[PDB]
Amino acid sequence: MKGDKKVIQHLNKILGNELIAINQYFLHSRMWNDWGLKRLGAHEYHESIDEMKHADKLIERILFLEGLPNLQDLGKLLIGENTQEMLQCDLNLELKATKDLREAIVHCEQVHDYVSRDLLKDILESEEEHIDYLETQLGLIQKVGLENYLQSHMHE
Amino acid sequence: MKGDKKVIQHLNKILGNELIAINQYFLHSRMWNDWGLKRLGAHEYHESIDEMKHADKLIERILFLEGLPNLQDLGKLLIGENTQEMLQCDLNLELKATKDLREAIVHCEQVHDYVSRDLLKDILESEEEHIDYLETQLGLIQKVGLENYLQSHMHE
Amino acid sequence: MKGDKKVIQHLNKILGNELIAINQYFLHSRMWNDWGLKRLGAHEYHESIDEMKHADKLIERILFLEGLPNLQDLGKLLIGENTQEMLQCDLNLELKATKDLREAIVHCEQVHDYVSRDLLKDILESEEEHIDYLETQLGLIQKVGLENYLQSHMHE
Amino acid sequence: MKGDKKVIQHLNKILGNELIAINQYFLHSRMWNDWGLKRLGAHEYHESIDEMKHADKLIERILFLEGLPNLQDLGKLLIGENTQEMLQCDLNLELKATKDLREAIVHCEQVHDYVSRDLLKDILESEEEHIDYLETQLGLIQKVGLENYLQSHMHE
Amino acid sequence: MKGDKKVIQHLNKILGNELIAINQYFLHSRMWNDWGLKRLGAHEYHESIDEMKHADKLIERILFLEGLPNLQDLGKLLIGENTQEMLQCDLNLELKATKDLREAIVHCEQVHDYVSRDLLKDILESEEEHIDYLETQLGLIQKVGLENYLQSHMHE
Amino acid sequence: MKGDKKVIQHLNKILGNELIAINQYFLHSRMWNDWGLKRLGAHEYHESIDEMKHADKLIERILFLEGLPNLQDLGKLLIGENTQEMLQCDLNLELKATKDLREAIVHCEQVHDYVSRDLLKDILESEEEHIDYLETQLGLIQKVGLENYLQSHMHE
Amino acid sequence: MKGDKKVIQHLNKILGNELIAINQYFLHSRMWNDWGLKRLGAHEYHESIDEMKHADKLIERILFLEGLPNLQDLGKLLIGENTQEMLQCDLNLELKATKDLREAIVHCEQVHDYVSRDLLKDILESEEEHIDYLETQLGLIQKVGLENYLQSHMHE
């Protein structure tokens, strides 16, 4: 079913953010596991998988709309080098992600692509949950101290 | 445990091929599903997952060797536009992949990184199984004809 | 709860489309079964049942909003005489139904009937799924040939 | 128990035919598997296994009769280059085998080795079942065409 | 996947050794069973089966590498006339087998056919296990005496 | 089966390293248990058991190759006096063990003792896993602090 | 709990004997397995494990008493060259062990370390059971003859 060209462009822009997220969260996960912070590693792995599921649904919608999913262009990964900075990199990425989702939804609404809108709303819901998670972790580091926060994420 | 620098370079080169494969096989999978060729779609999905598992193990080894896994640089996806060409693109990618695995193993053997060698041998085994699969599919298209081959991959 | 007069008019228009589809899809199903294309017959039966469910929910929403659900004014059924034509007739009907759905959602949004909109969006998602199925089948007739396509739909 | 010398010679002749069939059918099975024709590969594997079981029973009977089972002399394998040739090579072998079985049964009856006869009759029943299968496959190739015939033997 | 010509020649040589072993061990098994030494017969049967499995894997690898598996040429069986001779015949055959496997592994390593090496290494492990069994049996005959050794192998 | 004299010397050297490790890790385990660091005690016990298993397999391989396994010449145990020191003493030992493993594998490869190599490679993989654990613990002492690290290892 | 200095010396002496027995019995076990005398090999393995458990308990007792368990000094292993000698070597070692146990219990009683005495008494009961086993095996070698005795220990 031939879709709106600019909608497909938005979907592909959203897909690009998810593809960045997949790799950034997967790398952070395995960095945390390597450091013995297995609870962070497992959670961040699950964030990676969730972005993979989002990318899948975007790929599928783009193909249905008879566009070409762009998996070739990979934007810049925000890889941190310690726990506090990795969380902030994830958060910075999510704030960019939600901004683009909102702009995409605006355009879907204008051209009446209500099904695409619904898909992007569902993704936006998951990304805001991720932001909640990240904001909470950063807040906890201040409340309990970095050493305790890391201690609490050694074991699953 | 600090690894050999050139070994880590090889591992990262292997990882780059797997990252290309992940996206190429995932896209082909969803293209086939979109076309109603669900048996090809499901198989190619499983090839994608297998490359994901390989990438994971490479990322983990690189981190253990105290290198930096490169998930930023994404080489060129060989995306075909019909079944015969998609299979050939996968095969062309695998023949490149196995060549690089062999060179990587040569160097691991020289510097005595026997554990890395074992990991790359296991990956090489999976990639040669994939080549077998691809060569067989291409051969079947000739034997049964394209229309029958596609018919036989409509339903799972 | 007194609803907007024109919302109810839209809902009754969508209802009218679903009533055509019920009968069109049911007849196509029984024609395919009579021809021994039992897999098409079964799938088309489930398409008819799905439209019956949408009709039910429209009738319920109209009665809640204190309108009169129009089950009396049956529009034109698009019945094919062979499989390719029947699939195309379903597609043609679905493409009108989705245009009317989008127009109804526009109006629901204007007058703030957000629950009616949500219902129409859910129905729209179904109908686009039906369009995906129908386009996929017509593409498969091309890719594998008519004789093979029909063969693959003889047995469930 | 001292058997008749000519009976033992016949049993070794039947054994020799079975040792050819074991290898011919095993190789044909693995060829069909390599080509993706896994239904033929599996069925031919089971034919090879059945010949192994016959060979076992012949070896056991020859030893009971105080003869020396000949596993050293391997006759000519009839290996085909395509499916039609392979099937016809199997059939040519089976027809030689059943001829030899009948001549061996005649001699067992003449010298009153009724147990050896009963063993050979059971093997003969198995070989006639393989001939039925082969003649049926060759006829199916004519009825449905080679492309369809190979299509139907891709999947198990 | 086109393999190295000499690797394939090596694989066919190893296949030739396995084909001798299959028949030699199968005949020894059935001789021991005929003599009432059923524990020896059973164990020797399982050695024959294990060689059959090795031969299968070699055939499959040769065909994947686009060579022709040689099941036609059958080398000399080493058949003993009593238990001690039969065990020593098996041991002589195994010592030739492992010499050939080492030479083939050398060549696989030199041309970087690492998957073929791994296959031959696994077969070599099984053959060294068989050498261990055989040397151990020959030793037990000396320790417990032949009559006791045979007594211990009457009943499974 | 007569093995290479120097292979057996290497195997006995690896064996000697495992015998030190068994005793070193067992004592460390019981020291941690006595101090109430039961999670470290349990984990170190399982490290000791794992070395016992490696020792067993080395002893078995040496006896198969007709050498004399040296369980008599116990080298120097590296016992720490506090947790950080004990972990470092384990790491120091593992780093010598892996160097000796790589030297032994070099020689096994030269004289074509591929089964001994395979055994040593499997042991090497274990030992590198142990190194990963030990480095991770020493890094965690930094990241979370000593008091927190010890606290997290009081209870299993 | 600070223990008596000479109690701790006795416990380390007992521990030293247990450490010898661990290695002597483990090597004897694996020699018997290599020779195909698997029932002896299994029983001797379990004797080695029992000494391992006694060593554990002595190490734990010494640490509780604030001593340093000596796992560094390994006394002379008594290794036989045949079954008869191996059993007698074990028995000679056990007879020195029980001597040293009795002298340690005397001292424990004198200084009122009644819990250490109870531990040593339990270990003495195990060692006297081992002496019973060993004396009985040497008696059986006489009563059934060496060939029969060895025959009865081939199979588990």
Ligand code: HEM
């Ligand atoms: C750095 C690149 C990637 C890595 C390291 C990675 C890793 C993984 C791993 C370890 C799994 C679990 C599979 C299993 O154990 O069964 C997985 C699952 C999955 N991956 Fe990835 N992946 C990567 C990229 C992608 C991409 C780019 C996509 C889609 C475009 C994707 C889609 C999926 C899906 C759909 C699943 C299944 C999740 C489920 O269980 O429902 N992955 N991935």
Ligand code: HEM
């Ligand atoms: C206003 C028009 C119709 C409405 C609102 C309607 C509604 C429904 C509903 C709600 C169901 C149950 C679906 C479920 O499983 O949850 C159903 C079932 C069914 N409908 Fe209709 N339907 C309509 C017309 C028709 C027509 C014209 C036919 C046949 C010509 C038909 C044939 C069937 C059949 C065979 C079933 C399944 C009955 C069973 O349980 O065995 N329907 N319908």
Ligand code: HEM
């Ligand atoms: C003297 C020649 C042979 C004899 C007498 C023989 C006999 C047997 C027997 C009795 C079985 C067990 C069948 C059952 O009861 O299920 C068997 C299994 C088998 N044979 Fe043979 N065989 C021979 C040659 C071969 C050859 C040349 C190959 C392949 C190169 C082969 C491959 C196999 C395989 C793969 C199995 C299945 C083993 C398993 O996984 O359990 N055999 N054979």
Ligand code: HEM
């Ligand atoms: C040559 C030296 C040794 C060898 C070859 C050896 C071998 C083994 C083996 C193979 C096991 C069984 C592992 C399994 O679960 O599969 C074991 C268990 C064990 N070992 Fe050792 N060991 C040695 C020294 C020691 C020492 C010195 C100690 C204590 C100081 C010890 C304490 C233990 C304990 C407590 C167990 C578990 C027993 C149970 O099942 O409760 N080992 N050993």
Ligand SMILES: O=C1NC(=O)c2c(NCc3cc(F)ccc3O)cccc21
């Ligand atoms: O398709 C039809 N949907 C209807 O509601 C309907 C009819 N409704 C009569 C009616 C009027 C009213 F003012 C209040 C209640 C009520 O039932 C009559 C004929 C046909 C249809």
Ligand SMILES: O=C1NC(=O)c2c(NCc3cc(F)ccc3O)cccc21
């Ligand atoms: O396929 C072969 N079948 C055989 O029996 C055989 C051989 N016989 C050894 C033998 C055993 C015996 F119990 C009495 C006499 C005797 O010669 C030698 C090579 C090959 C084969």
Ligand SMILES: O=C1NC(=O)c2c(NCc3cc(F)ccc3O)cccc21
């Ligand atoms: O740690 C030890 N590993 C041993 O093999 C060993 C001993 N072996 C004696 C022996 C010699 C022989 F030529 C044949 C068999 C045999 O058992 C003696 C003392 C200590 C150890």
Ligand SMILES: [K+]
């Ligand atoms: K804390």
Ligand SMILES: [K+]
């Ligand atoms: K067909």
